[PDB]
Amino acid sequence: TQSYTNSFTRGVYYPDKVFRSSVLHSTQDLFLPFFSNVTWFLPFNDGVYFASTEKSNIIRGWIFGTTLDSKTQSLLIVNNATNVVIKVCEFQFCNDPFLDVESEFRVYSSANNCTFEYVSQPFLMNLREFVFKNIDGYFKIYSKHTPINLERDLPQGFSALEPLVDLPIGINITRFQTLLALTAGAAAYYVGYLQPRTFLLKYNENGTITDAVDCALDPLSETKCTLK
Amino acid sequence: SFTVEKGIYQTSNFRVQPTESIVRFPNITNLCPFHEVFNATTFASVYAWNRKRISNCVADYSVIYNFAPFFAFKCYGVSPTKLNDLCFTNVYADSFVIRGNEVSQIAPGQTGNIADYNYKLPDDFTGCVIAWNSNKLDSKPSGNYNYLYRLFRKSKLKPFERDISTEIYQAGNKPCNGVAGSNCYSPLQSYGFRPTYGVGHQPYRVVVLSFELLHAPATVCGPKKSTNLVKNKCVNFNFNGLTGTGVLTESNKKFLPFQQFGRDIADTTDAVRDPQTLEILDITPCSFGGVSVITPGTN
Ligand SMILES: *[C@@H]1O[C@H](CO)[C@@H](O[C@@H]2O[C@H](CO)[C@@H](O)[C@H](O)[C@H]2NC(C)=O)[C@H](O)[C@H]1NC(C)=O
Ligand SMILES: *[C@@H]1O[C@H](CO)[C@@H](O)[C@H](O)[C@H]1NC(C)=O
Ligand SMILES: *[C@@H]1O[C@H](CO)[C@@H](O)[C@H](O)[C@H]1NC(C)=O
Numbered sequence: 001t002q003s004y005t006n007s008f009t010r011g012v013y014y015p016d017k018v019f020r021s022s023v024l025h026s027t028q029d030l031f032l033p034f035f036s037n038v039t040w041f042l043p044f045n046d047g048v049y050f051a052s053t054e055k056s057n058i059i060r061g062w063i064f065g066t067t068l069d070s071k072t073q074s075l076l077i078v079n080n081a082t083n084v085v086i087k088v089c090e091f092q093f094c095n096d097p098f099l100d101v102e103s104e105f106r107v108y109s110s111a112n113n114c115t116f117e118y119v120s121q122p123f124l125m126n127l128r129e130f131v132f133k134n135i136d137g138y139f140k141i142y143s144k145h146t147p148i149n150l151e152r153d154l155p156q157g158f159s160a161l162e163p164l165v166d167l168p169i170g171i172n173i174t175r176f177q178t179l180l181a182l183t184a185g186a187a188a189y190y191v192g193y194l195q196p197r198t199f200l201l202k203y204n205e206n207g208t209i210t211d212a213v214d215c216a217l218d219p220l221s222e223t224k225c226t227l228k
Numbered sequence: 229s230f231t232v233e234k235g236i237y238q239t240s241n242f243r244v245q246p247t248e249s250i251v252r253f254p255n256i257t258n259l260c261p262f263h264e265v266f267n268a269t270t271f272a273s274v275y276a277w278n279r280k281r282i283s284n285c286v287a288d289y290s291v292i293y294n295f296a297p298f299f300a301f302k303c304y305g306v307s308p309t310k311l312n313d314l315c316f317t318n319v320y321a322d323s324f325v326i327r328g329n330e331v332s333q334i335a336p337g338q339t340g341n342i343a344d345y346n347y348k349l350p351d352d353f354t355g356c357v358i359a360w361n362s363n364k365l366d367s368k369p370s371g372n373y374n375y376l377y378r379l380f381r382k383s384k385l386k387p388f389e390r391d392i393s394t395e396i397y398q399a400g401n402k403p404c405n406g407v408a409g410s411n412c413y414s415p416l417q418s419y420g421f422r423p424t425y426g427v428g429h430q431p432y433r434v435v436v437l438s439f440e441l442l443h444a445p446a447t448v449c450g451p452k453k454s455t456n457l458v459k460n461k462c463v464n465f466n467f468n469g470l471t472g473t474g475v476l477t478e479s480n481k482k483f484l485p486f487q488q489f490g491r492d493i494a495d496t497t498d499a500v501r502d503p504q505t506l507e508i509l510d511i512t513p514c515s516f517g518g519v520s521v522i523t524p525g526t527n
């Protein structure tokens with residue numbers, strides 16, 4: 001179910017936890033290039049951009065794993081009404097893992113050992129944007145919940161992605177999948193990728209990023225980056 | 229020179245000295261529970277020894293000494309006083325009950341029945357060993373037979389291994405065929421504990437703590453102390469891994485709930501939130517300047 005559409009100016013997250021006010025800053029990190037391909041509806045590569053706008057919350061949970069099998073460690077996330085569970089257990093998943101609503105037999109056949117656990121408020125709570133990146137034995141995520149007017153495409157605007165949680169796991173991620181809870185139904189979500197680039201972020205006097213410039217989109221933006 | 233003409237001369241500099249020091253660090257909440265490895269009231273058998281993994285918490289070793297005088301308290305790879313100053317990735321706790329005079333075999337390089345048939349330690353073990361008497365709780369006048377231990381085995385044990393297989397240990401040439409008798413002995417033998425037994429045969433409880441390192445974040449470290457908070461004075465500070473000297477004052481910055489520090493155009497720290505109590509503090513450097521001497525001619 002492949003499709004392609006533009007990306008516009010979406011997918012900018014705070015590089016670190018430093019407060020700045022009314023200062024233009026330059027950063028060299030992984031970002032989603034402006035005006036790029038995003039697949040519409042899975043190798044991990046070096047990053048993932050995720051979004052969805054369905055109210056039914058049928059999409060819930062991402063399975064991160066190197067082999068997507070019981071052989072290698074897999075990261076499982078489940079968001080339900082109460083909490084969220086993060087595990088490093090090497091489950092035996094199915095070809096089409098989906099929730100029953102609530103047996104997990106269809107999601108995975110069996111569970112086995114793992115050495116890490118976590119519980120907190122569920123991530124989910126309009127267009128919801130997510131970023132999943134893993135580095136130096138740390139799996140960091142970002143999110144942003146934005147009320148969006150009735151539209152069939154990503155709006156022309158800017159919305160920063162604040163960090164949520166970092167986990168000292170230290171396991172490689174190469175593939176990831178999607179999870180649904182079911183009767184026939186329909187879903188809509190987009191997938192993007194992260195690339196090493198150089199940006200130029202703008203901060204207001206309250207410490208929030210309000211605008212950005214890509215330093216390799218076109219010669220005028222390069223001039224803006226050089227002149228700061 | 230010994231003669232000075234009329235003029236103003238810059239001689240030296242000066243700087244206000246710090247008065248005291250301030251250290252701040254987050255609340256100590258995730259205490260590693262050691263009152264569960266201690267107080268089990270059930271330590272199982274030595275041939276089936278429980279293994280418990282401790283991770284993702286703050287571990288305080290002061291609570292260890294809160295128990296009865298320990299018969300054996302031996303530390304090999306770490307100084308006992310510095311247990312709270314060095315921290316590792318994970319810690320494993322092993323517990324069982326053995327005889328009084330078999331304590332000396334629970335150590336690297338030891339040889340003996342309990343050393344090589346039930347619990348084998350590696351040469352480079354890093355950790356401490358806990359052993360204290362528990363005669364009053366693991367002894368009955370009739371006799372205790374719930375604490376078994378292996379007696380016969382085909383081969384030795386690799387370090388940090390367990391075996392629960394219960395089969396007839398064949399010693400003769402003819403097959404045992406799964407029955408006991410001539411040259412066919414059961415491998416597990418039970419202890420006997422009574423209140424009148426002499427020292428060296430009374431039950432003893434053993435707890436072993438193991439430390440290790442590997443390519444992963446520590447995530448387990450000892451309790452780190454902290455000082456109070458002072459303001460409006462030239463003081464040193466260490467606000468959760470950041471070091472600097474300056475004067476702490478009240479700040480009016482609207483930090484978002486996930487920043488911890490603040491910067492300026494020239495990339496210098498000028499605002500920090502207090503880890504213990506969430507509050508934004510503004511820092512300024514302590515005063516300094518040149519010194520000039522005004523003088524007419526020495527004539
Ligand atoms: C579950 O337990 C197994 C052991 O039964 C763990 O396997 C160990 O994993 C560590 C970390 O990769 C290695 O250093 C060891 O050499 C492994 N030992 C064995 C015997 O396999 C496993 O990591 C645990 N966790 C999961 C998710 O399987
Ligand atoms: C986006 O769609 C596909 C994605 O593979 C690509 O071939 C195409 O060149 C991209 N750009 C446009 C404008 O379609
Ligand atoms: C959500 O999942 C957790 C996982 O253990 C479970 O404890 C909880 O009961 C679930 N919520 C509901 C409403 O069942």
Ligand SMILES: *[C@@H]1O[C@H](CO)[C@@H](O)[C@H](O)[C@H]1NC(C)=O
Binds near residue numbers: 173
């Ligand atoms: C993941 O696998 C690659 C090779 O496929 C390896 O270099 C890397 O260390 C692995 N990361 C882990 C196990 O965290």
Ligand SMILES: *[C@@H]1O[C@H](CO)[C@@H](O)[C@H](O)[C@H]1NC(C)=O
Binds near residue numbers: 204206482
């Ligand atoms: C920053 O916060 C102050 C106080 O809440 C507010 O008055 C001001 O409008 C904010 N600045 C913005 C939103 O740009």
Ligand SMILES: *[C@@H]1O[C@H](CO)[C@@H](O)[C@H](O)[C@H]1NC(C)=O
Binds near residue numbers: 263267268269
């Ligand atoms: C720990 O020892 C004390 C000493 O009597 C006892 O009162 C307490 O119940 C014990 N904790 C347990 C057994 O969990």
Ligand SMILES: *[C@@H]1O[C@H](CO)[C@@H](O)[C@H](O)[C@H]1NC(C)=O
Binds near residue numbers: 506
């Ligand atoms: C740390 O403990 C103090 C004393 O009870 C408390 O006032 C403070 O709120 C605690 N810190 C946090 C982050 O809750």
